[PDB]
Design a protein around this nucleic acid. Structure first.
Length: 218
RNA sequence: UGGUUGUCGUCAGCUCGUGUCGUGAGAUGUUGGGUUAAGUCCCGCAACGAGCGCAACCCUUGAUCUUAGUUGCCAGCAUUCA
């Protein structure tokens, strides 16, 4: 674990008191996360992600934070599961039907590029249907092949991704969440008390879940 | 009284559904950052590509192609006052 920077939390002025149960001491005006609770909390997560994948359940990684974007993506694609990496769209889950309508439309613009329909209309169309595609793939490229709602979310930094959390709860979707000290643990079903700010930390902890999907599929 | 006249005729916006926010009336998107002649456009953002009015749809003029060459046209030939 801590070669990767997981133990390091946020400062003391931005704690949440519910994270007291997961904190072991403050040093240079930063809380330290208790690695002996982490490991067990990572192990409990790992079994819950393993069991869920073996039932054929679909997990949606969600890391819009600059230090999760690439991590999430690489680990979602490796794991053959959905991601959101760029911006969580209001009503991604609750309003899933109206997103589905743009996943159709994105896939419909691709088929227009693949049949050479883009050579018949132009110049005006093509500008605005690349521009629509570029924009749609950006935001919806991770969830492109998700036909039905995910059976759980893997979140990173719930306090940034509040909307994703808020949504998941409203559909009783289980969530799996890297919480730093700042973050409320009670929102989340399976909690991983850890750094979300350090790239190695996230990359480590996502990868172990990805692994946990891959080992179920075997 | 009908109808038809004059007379305030453009002059400024209304939104996609569901989702979201409030006990509720409502608010959001359709408060922000630039931009345009603009009711424009991009970037936004618990709202998400983009919608109706606008414009266009009608008619006319500006270039050129295809078809049609007669009663139109004559460059190239015969002509003659033409």
């Amino acid at each position: 674990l801590l070669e990767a920077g997981v133990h390091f939390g946020h400062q003391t002025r931005r704690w949440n008191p519910k994270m007291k149960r997961y904190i072991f001491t403050e040093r240079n005006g930063i809380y330290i996360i208790d690695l002996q609770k982490t490991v067990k909390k990572v192990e409990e997560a790992y079994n819950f992600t393993k069991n869920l994948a073996a039932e054929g359940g679909k997990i949606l990684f969600v890391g819009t934070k600059k230090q999760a974007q690439d991590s999430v993506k690489e680990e979602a694609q490796r794991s053959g599961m959905y991601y959101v990496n760029q911006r969580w769209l209001g009503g991604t889950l609750t309003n899933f039907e109206t997103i589905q309508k743009r996943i159709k439309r994105l896939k419909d613009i691709e088929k227009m590029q693949e049949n050479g329909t883009f050579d018949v209309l132009p110049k005006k169309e093509v500008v605005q249907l690349k521009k629509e595609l570029e924009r749609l793939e950006k935001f919806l490229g991770g969830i492109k092949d998700m036909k039905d709602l995910p059976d759980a979310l893997f979140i990173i930094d719930p306090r940034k991704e509040r909307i994703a959390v808020a949504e998941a709860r409203k559909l009783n979707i289980p969530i799996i969440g890297i919480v730093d000290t700042n973050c409320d643990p009670d929102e989340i079903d399976v909690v991983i008390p850890a750094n979300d700010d350090a790239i190695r930390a996230v990359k480590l902890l996502t990868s172990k879940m990805a692994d946990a999907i891959l080992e179920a599929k075997q």
